[PDB]
Design an enzyme around this catalytic site. Sequence first.
Site, short mmCIF file in Angstrom:
data_model
loop_
_atom_site.label_atom_id
_atom_site.label_comp_id
_atom_site.label_asym_id
_atom_site.label_seq_id
_atom_site.Cartn_x
_atom_site.Cartn_y
_atom_site.Cartn_z
N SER A 5 48.24 5.16 -26.41
CA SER A 5 48.85 3.60 -26.10
C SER A 5 48.77 3.29 -27.29
CB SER A 5 48.63 2.80 -25.37
OG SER A 5 49.59 3.45 -24.06
N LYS B 202 51.43 1.64 -29.86
CA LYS B 202 52.41 0.88 -29.26
C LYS B 202 52.84 -0.40 -30.75
CE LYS B 202 53.14 2.37 -24.86
NZ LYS B 202 51.45 2.44 -23.82
N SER C 143 51.35 -2.82 -21.71
CA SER C 143 51.22 -1.04 -22.32
C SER C 143 52.19 -0.06 -22.01
CB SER C 143 49.61 -0.33 -22.29
OG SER C 143 49.36 0.18 -22.98
N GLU D 19 56.67 9.13 -25.15
CA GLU D 19 55.66 8.77 -23.92
C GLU D 19 56.33 9.99 -23.01
OE1 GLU D 19 52.90 7.85 -23.50
OE2 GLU D 19 53.26 5.73 -25.17
N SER E 108 44.66 4.75 -23.43
CA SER E 108 44.36 5.56 -22.31
C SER E 108 44.42 6.36 -22.56
CB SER E 108 44.06 4.96 -20.90
OG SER E 108 43.53 4.11 -20.68
O1 LIG Z 1 48.20 11.69 -9.06
C1 LIG Z 1 49.01 10.75 -8.07
O2 LIG Z 1 48.79 11.16 -7.23
C2 LIG Z 1 50.16 10.20 -9.40
C3 LIG Z 1 50.74 9.79 -9.88
C4 LIG Z 1 50.99 8.29 -10.08
C5 LIG Z 1 50.67 7.45 -11.24
C6 LIG Z 1 50.27 7.34 -12.33
N1 LIG Z 1 50.09 6.57 -13.50
C7 LIG Z 1 49.44 6.21 -13.70
O3 LIG Z 1 48.05 5.94 -13.08
C8 LIG Z 1 49.54 5.36 -15.47
C9 LIG Z 1 48.42 5.09 -16.28
C10 LIG Z 1 48.10 3.49 -16.61
C11 LIG Z 1 46.21 3.36 -17.29
C12 LIG Z 1 45.53 4.75 -17.67
S1 LIG Z 1 47.23 5.86 -16.38
B1 LIG Z 1 50.86 9.44 -12.25
O4 LIG Z 1 52.37 9.25 -13.14
O5 LIG Z 1 49.46 9.79 -13.52
O6 LIG Z 1 50.66 10.35 -11.73
O1 LIG Z 2 46.20 0.59 -22.70
C1 LIG Z 2 46.11 1.09 -21.75
O2 LIG Z 2 44.40 0.75 -21.37
C2 LIG Z 2 47.00 2.02 -21.06
C3 LIG Z 2 47.93 2.87 -21.79
C4 LIG Z 2 48.93 3.34 -20.10
C5 LIG Z 2 49.97 4.60 -20.64
C6 LIG Z 2 49.22 5.10 -22.11
N1 LIG Z 2 48.72 6.11 -21.70
C7 LIG Z 2 48.87 7.24 -20.46
O3 LIG Z 2 50.44 7.13 -20.38
C8 LIG Z 2 47.97 8.46 -19.75
C9 LIG Z 2 48.27 9.50 -19.64
C10 LIG Z 2 47.02 10.49 -20.31
C11 LIG Z 2 47.89 11.57 -20.71
C12 LIG Z 2 49.21 11.51 -20.46
S1 LIG Z 2 49.89 10.38 -21.09
B1 LIG Z 2 48.49 4.52 -23.05
O4 LIG Z 2 47.83 5.80 -23.90
O5 LIG Z 2 46.89 3.24 -22.43
#
Ligand SMILES: O=C(O)C[C@@H]1CC[C@H](NC(=O)Cc2cccs2)[B-](O)(O)O1
Ligand SMILES: O=C(O)C[C@@H]1CC[C@H](NC(=O)Cc2cccs2)B(O)O1
Length: 263
Positions: A45, A48, A105, A141, A212
């Site tokens: 991220s 961005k 993000s 993304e 992340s």
């Molecule tokens: O596992 C599961 O039961 C479903 C998950 C739910 C939400 C998850 N999404 C995130 O957490 C967004 C992030 C923010 C920072 C790093 S990742 B997911 O869409 O990857 O699947």
């Molecule tokens: O800014 C931050 O620290 C959080 C932010 C979350 C959104 C983006 N990450 C992802 O969507 C996780 C993923 C891992 C593998 C596929 S998608 B990003 O790199 O970071």
Amino acid sequence: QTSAVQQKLAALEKSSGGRLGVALIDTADNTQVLYRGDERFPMCSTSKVMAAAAVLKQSETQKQLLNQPVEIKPADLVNYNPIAEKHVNGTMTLAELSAAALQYSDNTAMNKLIAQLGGPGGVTAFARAIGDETFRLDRTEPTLNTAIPGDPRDTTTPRAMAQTLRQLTLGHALGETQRAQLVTWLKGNTTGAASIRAGLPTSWTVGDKTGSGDYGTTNDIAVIWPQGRAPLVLVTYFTQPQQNAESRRDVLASAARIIAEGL
Ligand SMILES: O=C(O)C[C@@H]1CC[C@H](NC(=O)Cc2cccs2)[B-](O)(O)O1
Ligand SMILES: O=C(O)C[C@@H]1CC[C@H](NC(=O)Cc2cccs2)B(O)O1
Ligand SMILES: [K+]
């Protein structure tokens, strides 16, 4: 040569089990401190920033571009969309998308910035236009965060990203009002207090963008206004050997603390 700061960063890295990349530019004297500064890392991220900056550059010749609405549809939502999901079946302006991508993000917002630029390659083209021959964005993304070791897609080096972040925020890669807007956005980031910020004296001001990804990839890129001296630009990138590794924002804080103690 290997400096005392570089030796401390190597000790931190060894304890962490992962791979750490650091680039500092101290604008007090234009000197640099690098650790794995020419190795590639997945940006996640932190990319961005480049996308938002590329739209800011477009806006220099279109006074109304940042007010232009972009439709958000249910199908546009991906894995992390806290702002965009509130506007499904509605619109967000390019300014709103930029702010959401940078400060929250939001991945749907990032995808709209990428689309405004004609795809990932439009982000790369902007990087080239401002002197960065290293950055590459190859995917949208969420797949740009797969962060697979050895994969060149969606990577840069610490050295290149620090130089570019300097030119964007403190130099003249953007027009004056666009640079100020980018700085305002970065200073209002919500996600950064555990990363570079956490390793620096509490009186200093920071604007940053985190990321992340898979492989426990934990990144932060920052402009820093220390008390009593000229600004710094600091990139800290960290990635780990196992796909499911946990985030390690503390390692970034530790790297920043070593850098600050070395000034
Ligand atoms: O596992 C599961 O039961 C479903 C998950 C739910 C939400 C998850 N999404 C995130 O957490 C967004 C992030 C923010 C920072 C790093 S990742 B997911 O869409 O990857 O699947
Ligand atoms: O800014 C931050 O620290 C959080 C932010 C979350 C959104 C983006 N990450 C992802 O969507 C996780 C993923 C891992 C593998 C596929 S998608 B990003 O790199 O970071
Ligand atoms: K472009």
